């Protein structure tokens, strides 16, 4: 109801955790668990590449359809683009429907 | 062929290929007697013009001629939307011209 496509078996979840690494232990043996760690924490790359099948337009259309397009009136920032300080930014929501056919 | 069958089909279409577009436009034609079948010298003078830069000497022919030297004569508003906005260039390759469904 939100927006998509709905499946059955959709992309698995991905879950990922840092192991514990315990500090120094006690000399003497002791059965409770573990509380004391070695502060840690875990960087890296995520790389994800999915294949999209399109479904082209055949229109019959004579005028020209309505697109998205970007304004060429002169702006402080471009749009979909980084400010003077670094921060992306989505300006507007975009959906998917501005080609047209018959019903 | 005969009197009583059709010598083409009315071909108006276009077809989008990867990197070729083909496009194809029929239209229906009109042609009178031009200058009563005669070849006529014509001028500047036989215009009533006279100034120099203006001046002209020729000859009006009772031929005509077919013109498609125009983009929208083979490319529809939407095909022309299509090519602008999703090509960095084109340029043509190849011509068809048929002539047929002759009526005097």
Redesign the interface.
């Known amino acids: 109801l939100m927006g998509g496509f709905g499946m059955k078996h959709p992309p698995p979840q991905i879950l990922i955790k840092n192991t514990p690494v315990p500090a120094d232990p006690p000399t003497a043996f002791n059965k409770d668990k573990l509380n004391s760690f070695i502060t840690q924490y875990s960087t890296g790359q995520v790389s994800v590449e999915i294949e999209w099948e399109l479904q082209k337009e055949n ?1 019959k ?5 309505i ?1 998205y397009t970007s304004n060429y009136y002169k702006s402080n920032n471009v749009e979909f683009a980084v400010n003077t300080e670094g921060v992306y930014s989505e300006p507007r929501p975009i959906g998917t429907r501005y080609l047209t056919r018959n019903l | 062929d005969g009197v009583g069958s059709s010598s083409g089909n009315w071909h108006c279409d276009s077809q989008w290929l990867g990197d070729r577009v083909i496009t194809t436009s029929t239209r229906t034609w009109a042609l009178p007697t031009y200058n009563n079948h005669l070849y006529k010298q014509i001028s500047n003078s036989t215009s009533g013009g006279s100034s120099n830069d203006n001046a002209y000497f020729g000859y009006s022919t009772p031929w005509g001629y077919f013109d498609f030297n125009r983009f929208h004569c083979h490319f ?3 095909d ?2 299509r090519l602008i ?1 999703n090509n960095w260039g084109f340029r043509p390759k190849r011509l068809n011209f048929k002539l047929f469904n002759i009526q005097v």
């Open positions: 229109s259309r004579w005028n020209p359809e697109q | 529809s508003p939407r022309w939307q906005n």
